Design a protein around this ligand. Sequence first.
Ligand SMILES: [Cl-]
Length: 225
Amino acid sequence: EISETNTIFKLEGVSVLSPLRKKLDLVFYLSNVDGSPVITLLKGNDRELSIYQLNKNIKMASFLPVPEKPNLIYLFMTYTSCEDNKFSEPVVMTLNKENTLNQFKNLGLLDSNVTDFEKCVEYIRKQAILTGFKISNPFVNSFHLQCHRGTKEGTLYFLPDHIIFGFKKPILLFDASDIESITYSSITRLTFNASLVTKDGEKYEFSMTDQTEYAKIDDYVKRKQ
Ligand SMILES: [Cl-]
């Protein structure tokens, strides 16, 4: 099923966080059934996860920064399952840039003395384009900040069309048009709480946001309304 012929691109040893924490190989290839592009995450020859019909089944795909780790980058994707019976499903992996660069040099995808990891991002985005989907790179307007959801810290990403709270379970993804309101409230002298409610009546509290980020968040919301 996966052969050297038929594989577009393979990245070994990516660190998958969701829907499981495991070091796996990312493979983009063409099905032998119909030649249709498939993304899978492999342990050895075994498949942990597959995404098929990428043209219609990939809903969201973005490179996102890892806060404080310039050494890493997230790839985040949501998808309808191969059997069209499971919807908006999240995958998150980190890529180590130094290793990704180095692997790319070994596969001859990049000349020996390439310093710039954004060359890898250009290639991967191109491989998505050829393969029927698009990966956004919204950060390289958008912003992200640390907050708590209860006792657990997480990160809030304010993207052109989505807000993400990631990436410990459960990852929250909000379409920007589903925000009904945000109400602000304070708890510290240097922080504020953001109470967000969605069109379906669900309320999420994001506590302890630095008040440097209020200006940004309010302007975001007002624009998206
Ligand atoms: Cl987005």
